[PDB]
Amino acid sequence: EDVFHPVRAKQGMVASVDATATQVGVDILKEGGNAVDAAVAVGYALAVTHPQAGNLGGGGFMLIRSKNGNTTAIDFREMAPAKATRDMFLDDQGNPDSKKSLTSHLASGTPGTVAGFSLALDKYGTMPLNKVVQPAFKLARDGFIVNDALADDLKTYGSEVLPNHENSKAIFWKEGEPLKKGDTLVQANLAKSLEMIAENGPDEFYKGTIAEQIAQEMQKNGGLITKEDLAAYKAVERTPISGDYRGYQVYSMPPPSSGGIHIVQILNILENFDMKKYGFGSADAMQIMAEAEKYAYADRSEYLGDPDFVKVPWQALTNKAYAKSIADQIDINKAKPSSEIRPGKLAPYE
Amino acid sequence: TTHYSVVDKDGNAVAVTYTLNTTFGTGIVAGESGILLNNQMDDFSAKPGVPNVYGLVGGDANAVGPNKRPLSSMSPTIVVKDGKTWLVTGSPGGSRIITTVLQMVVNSIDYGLNVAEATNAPRFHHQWLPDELRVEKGFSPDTLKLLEAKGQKVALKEAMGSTQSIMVGPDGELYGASDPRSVDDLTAGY
């Protein structure tokens, strides 16, 4: 009956954007590691095999749910440098310069990935950091074959930035061109970084040699990340944002992410419609969801931000009565122009 | 951005979404560390009312500030059915992460699609501004015609996301699915 079939397993499972990283995660599970152990191992592996997004120099979020139901969120989102300012990306005329926020050294926030993985591993994992970093270390030291995905990304997106920086070009470029499928990508410097993290712990990144290398890269090129920034960074465990949709409970990321709030807000809106009845790919279902989405994104533009800096009205935004007030505005036969949609009035729902 | 999911033999689950923001971030390696640096600062609102690379806008709440964390759309998510972890999902996509994950949840709950079916199904998206109903290839011409008659401004664009999900059966059995939009990916178990 099915055209599409899921992969099946009876014990453990890992799904990731990269075969090598997935296999790393599966091996950890097979060795006895838990989901958190495997998750951290995959995260470090991707930092090597998927330089496009896997990283040590970026940040992110982790949602953890124990076999006992305990659900929590790990915020390891980057922190803007202490020297960052409200108008730092504006040009002399007062207009934002995307070059500054996307390709200059001013575009970087203090990395949180290493901090987040250790916070999670230490409290919810069972293996030592060195054990979960080892697979990544070998991949960086011994290298791996460039596949279609990486070759394509290096040629398409990579060409726009990698060759413009000596150290980046020395690693990802070869014979004046991006590495091609079949080539071997060895990352000796990253291997050293990984080895030092495995031996000295996360402090190596935030206070050790890595931190020095980051601070210098910045200082020499007009960047802002300092050693003080790195030493002050911290990952934060936060309560997940959640909701109930037709008896199913949905858990996702809370601020500094807007994801959890809006996914729950939209589901709340949709709950007022018989979605199953309309069915997938129907104009009615698509109409209802598109309209619901408009209100959420309008709200996102006004109420969402770092909760440690601004009070996010998450209760009102995920309030079913508020969702009902939006659902009653949706005309299944006529779309409402965005020009007629503004952030909602939350007062009656707070 | 990239997302991955894990479920172990004991039923513990982890969903991780992490990123450098754009592909390869700034493309800048930090000295001799071999580590690429993110360009996450673009996730802040640089100026009230002006869109960032994903077309997202902001004001005071998401304004740049010292030590502040820029607002994200990342949505590692877990859905619970009958008191047990049921769906573990997530996806990259900047502003589209919210709608991509939303669709996985709707596809699973409302349309009863299995995890691979929900993953391979086409995706659509509307983020208020720009005012357009973004769609991937895959929707019926009859359906798009009806949407246009309803007033939607349909815009056919690039594929959205890369979901990497795991569904947990009522008997402990695991079901997983990688995304057709991403080559060289993998969902595997034992």
Curated annotation (Swiss-Prot), chain B:
Region of interest (Disordered), residue spans: 171-190
Reported impact of R123A: Not processed into its subunits, loss of enzymatic activity
Residues the entry annotates as binding L-glutamate: T19, N21, Q40, D43, S72, S73, G93, G94
Active site: T1
Effect upon mutating R181G: Not processed into its subunits, loss of enzymatic activity
Entry protein name: Glutathione hydrolase small chain
Gene name as annotated: ggt
Full-length numbering of the shown residues: 391 to 580 of 580
